[PDB]
Amino acid sequence: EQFRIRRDKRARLLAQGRDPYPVAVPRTHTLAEVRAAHPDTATEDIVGVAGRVIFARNSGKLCFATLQDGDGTQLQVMISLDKVGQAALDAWKADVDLGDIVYVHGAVISSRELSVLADCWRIAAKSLRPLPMSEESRVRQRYVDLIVRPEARAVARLRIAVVRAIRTALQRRGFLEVETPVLQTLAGGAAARPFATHSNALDIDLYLRIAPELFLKRCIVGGFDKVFELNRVFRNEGADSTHSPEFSMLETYQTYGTYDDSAVVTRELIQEVADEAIGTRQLPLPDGSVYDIDGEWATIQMYPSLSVALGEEITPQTTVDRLRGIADSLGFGHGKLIEELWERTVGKSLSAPTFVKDFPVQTTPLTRQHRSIPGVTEKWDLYLRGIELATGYSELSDPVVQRERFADQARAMVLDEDFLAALEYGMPPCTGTGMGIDRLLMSLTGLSIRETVLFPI
Amino acid sequence: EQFRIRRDKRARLLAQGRDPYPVAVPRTHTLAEVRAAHPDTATEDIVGVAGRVIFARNSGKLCFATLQDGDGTQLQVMISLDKVGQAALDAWKADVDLGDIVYVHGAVISSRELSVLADCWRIAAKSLRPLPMSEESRVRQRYVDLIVRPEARAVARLRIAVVRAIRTALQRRGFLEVETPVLQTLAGGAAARPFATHSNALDIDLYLRIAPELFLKRCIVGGFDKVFELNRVFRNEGADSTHSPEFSMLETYQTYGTYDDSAVVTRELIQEVADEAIGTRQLPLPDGSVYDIDGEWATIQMYPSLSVALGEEITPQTTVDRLRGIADSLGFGHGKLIEELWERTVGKSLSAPTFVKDFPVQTTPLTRQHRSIPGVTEKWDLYLRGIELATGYSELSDPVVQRERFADQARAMVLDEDFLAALEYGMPPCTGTGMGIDRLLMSLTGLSIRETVLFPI
Ligand SMILES: COc1nc(N)nc2c1C(=O)N([C@H]1CC[C@@H](O)CC1)C2
Ligand SMILES: COc1nc(N)nc2c1C(=O)N([C@H]1CC[C@@H](O)CC1)C2
Ligand SMILES: N[C@@H](CCCC[NH3+])C(=O)O
Ligand SMILES: N[C@@H](CCCC[NH3+])C(=O)O
């Protein structure tokens, strides 16, 4: 209803020569800065402050109101009669609503609560909607969420702190951030249905990237020692609590190191992120518990660990007829089956931060064959607080193998021949990694994927 | 031809038990690091180095070869007979081609040129393609370009240095980088044909963002004091030397400042970028000239400056029948005409860094009406070295005006009602800006748009 009462006070401010949306009011300080510089008498420090009025208490010849700056800091104001204007007091009473941004120049004082008492005051913006929420309305209107709910404020700022931490971490180690195409003639470097968009300029279809690996790899051919890219990827698939079709994603590549190297870094990275952004490696969680991610983290092998949990020897050689069987007696091909069985037994048991290494050849086209063990590739996954957080490879640089690997993939015939060309100019040995920002945050906080981004749907 | 000779030496290395693409060779130092620590005698510093062999000179019982690290630094190697192996020398002669990555452990020495003389040596990767180029092949194969052409190396690293400079600059001033949706239900915050992609998850079409403004604005409602976002946008339109359909783009928003504020920053920003990434504000250019971007930069008004150059008074009031006329006598509506005429007269004259401010209402739906002058909006553009580099607004926060502005835009009817909702919760006065990374680099270097990105097409 009050929609209309608000719109009325707007135009009755316009016509009256009052500006309800001024170009520029002279704020001298953020409320934070007033607080930070003032730990029942009066002081002669004068400031201009601005602030949302998120609490009124109009009372005759004095109105007391609370101002909340964007970040949520608060300073009370006391709009008075004798300090300037009787039209002042009336206009204040008349024209101020709740969720109204308000500039207030004057002196800052101790009260019976730190307030500021006005010489000047002026409306900086007029709300045409009061402040009130289901969680699928918080996401629809993050801009109100951010006003009403502190935790929204804190989470948004966390994601940001975390992303900066990552950049600090990588940069300190000599990593260089790069930009690779989002629109590509064919999308690759991962396994998912791409998004297709039609180009006017070319009259061909183009695909949004599912991942930067293939282009990041061209860079390593190029002479990049150490590279990464933090940026959205697009997977044209369903959404669940760990999956969304557009999400932010880290990738990383270092020359002259293997998956054993890239797992040391990933741990240090993650822990360094905890330190900067959170201040503890003893992570408090919604239920009140604490997940420790400090010290050293356990590595297991996929086949061995799967073997122990099944009570029988599973290997690269174990046939699919055998695996299908074991699979049934709990409830396509080999690689899928190994990972499936592993995840469904060992995977779901895990608590503490855990790496799992030495993976089925079938389901790892891009990662080098293992240096000693036949049948497996030098890939790891990291399961942190029971979430598939991150992946690392010793990267396959043999073009003929890589060609072979791809052709078989297609057989259930257009291959990325430029990718393959690049490799046959010579890619030095490198370990890549991959990590998801939403899950990084989930794994650290227990927040849902839908709370870790500013604007989902 | 040598394609096949190469592929042969690969499999004849495999079968022979030699690994042509090893998982991990123990590099102890980058060539840079060897150089940096060694300004015709011998020294007992031992290292393992890796490097592309970009020059052979095989000669009996000594081969001299040059190794080029990814960044382009060079150390010569001297594969010998007596220092280890006679099969060594032969295998070296036999199996080494050009564009081959090669690990060489041994002692570092002064020669008659700083080389390294080997105990061990081993092929790190085998090329199946020699090193050779038109400019529309350099772009098709940036990974070779980066190997062969220094300037490619330098440019790639420049773009990177520049992007870091921006982040430093903004962060120092207290800006917070944010991530807003690339996929949106309707795309806005600029004027261009969007890219449409179909979603499986929802069975609706979605549009890649043409710009982040509208979502960045929701953030300011949200309580963000100071925000920005450096990231690709997508405009489904033609390519020219200043326009590409996917490009990287900065946007910026500060509360409690106007377009006069955001132009001070933009200048300081740009100049600070020059200092960090280039080391001079006296910019050397291809023709050998120098563009000075130091000191203070000139502001002009659009109508006034257009008036002087036409020799007659043009204003908001000047009719379209008049403008069409002037337009003819050189060779839709008012706003378009003003900007058109301005660009075609004053625009093309400009040399020195120049701001142009106070713009036609029609062609600036999102920027506030000017605080005193009727008919114009408080928007500026920055023309640097004759290129439309950047834009700044005092941002329109009046929702009813903003609603009005939009409806008229549609009339040549679906409006972004959530955008409009956000504004009617109250957006404090803020100045936004917008800047293009490719043009930033063009404007600084004289490089084409197609050289400023890693991977175009
Ligand atoms: C929301 O996160 C994701 N959404 C989709 N739709 N797909 C993936 C993620 C995610 O975090 N992924 C990573 C998992 C660890 C590594 O394999 C890197 C990718 C895949
Ligand atoms: C390659 O750069 C661009 N490509 C397209 N297709 N459109 C634009 C640019 C660019 O740099 N733009 C900016 C110009 C200054 C400001 O108005 C911000 C946008 C628009
Ligand atoms: N492309 C991988 C991430 C990088 C892995 C290392 N090569 C993925 O989408 O999971
Ligand atoms: N959306 C603008 C850039 C930001 C201008 C300030 N609001 C553009 O695409 O040019």
Resolution for this PDB entry, in angstroms: 2.4
B228 touches chain A (CB under 8 A): no
Q: Are A297 and A267 in contact (CB under 8 A)?
A: yes
B261 CA distance to ligand 2 middle (Å):
22
Strands B226-234 and B176-177, sheet pairing = parallel
What SS3 state is found at A358? strand
The burial of A373, by beta-carbon neighbours within 10 Å (0-12 exposed, 13-18 middle, 19 or more buried), is given as: middle
Q: Are A402 and A396 in contact (CB under 8 A)?
A: yes
- Which helix (DSSP H) or strand (DSSP E) does residue B275 occupy? helix B259-277
Other beta carbons within 10 angstroms of residue B15's beta carbon come to 8
Instruction: Kindly state the tokens that stand for A447.
Output: 């927040």
A264 interface with B at CB cutoff 8 Å: no
CATH class of A148-452: alpha beta
Spatial distance between the Cα atoms of A379 and A237, rounded to a whole number of angstroms:
24
**Cα separation of A405 and A146, whole Å?**
48
Distances in whole angstroms, Cα of residue B366 to Cα of each of A317, B220, B359, B403, B416 = 65, 15, 12, 10, 13
3-state secondary structure of A36: helix
User: Does A147 touch chain B if contact means CB atoms closer than 8 Å?
Assistant: yes
Task: Report how far Cα B316 is from the mean position of its chain's Cα atoms.
Answer: 37
CA distance B33 to B21: 24
Q: Do the Cβ atoms of A106 and A116 come closer than 8 Å?
A: yes
Among protein residues, the one whose CA lies closest to atom 10 of ligand 1: A436
Ligand 4 centroid to Cα of residue A101, in Å, is 24
Question: Which residues fall within 8 angstroms of residue A91, CB to CB, at 6 or more apart?
Answer: A85
DSSP element (H, E) containing A252: strand A246-255
Q: What DSSP character marks residue B435?
A: E
Helix (H, G, I), strand (E, B) or coil at A255: strand
The Cα–Cα gap between A12 and A315 comes to: 80
Rg of the Cα atoms in chain A: 29
Q: How far apart are CA B11 and CA B18, in angstroms?
A: 9
Strand partners, B196: B207
**Both structure tokens of A431:** 């370990």
The Cα–Cα gap between B20 and A427 comes to 11
Task: Label residue A424 left, alpha or beta by phi (over 0 means left) and psi (-120 to 50 means alpha).
Answer: alpha
Q: What is the DSSP letter of B298?
A: E
Interhelix angle B2-14/B87-95, rounded to 10 degrees, is 140
Which of B30, B71, B68, B69 shows the shortest CA–CA distance to B48? Answer: B30
Paired tokens of A32: 């934070």
Looking at ligand 2, which atom is closest to the CA of residue B243? 4
Around Cβ B324, how many Cβ atoms within 10 Å? 13
List, edge to edge, every strand of the sheet that includes A246-255.
A176-177, A226-234, A246-255, A430-436, A387-394, A376-384, A354-360, A298-301
Judge whether A381 is annotated as a binding position: yes
Ligand 4: which of B193, B209, B210, B213 to mutate, judged by most atoms within 8 Å of the beta carbon?
B213
Instruction: Give whole-number Cα distances, A75 to A50, A114, B89, B152, in Å.
Output: 10, 6, 79, 54
Facing A200 at nearest CB: one of B159, B193, B220:
B193
Residue having the nearest C-alpha atom to atom 12 of ligand 1 = A436
Token pair listed for B305: 């400056």
Using DSSP's 3-state secondary structure scheme, residue B116 falls into strand
Question: With an 8 Å Cβ cutoff, are A183 and B245 in contact?
Answer: yes
Cα–Cα distance list, A263 to A161, A166, A216, A257 (Å) = 23, 15, 19, 10
Residue nearest atom 2 of ligand 1, based on CA coordinates: A243
Cα–Cα distance for residue pair A379/A369, rounded to 1 Å: 9
Point out the residue among A24, A147, A426 whose CB comes nearest to the CB of B258.
A24
Q: Which residues contact A350 (CB under 8 A, 6 or more apart)?
A: A383, A386
| Alpha-carbon A92 to chain mean position | 41
Task: Specify the ligand 4 atom closest to the Cα of B367.
Answer: 7
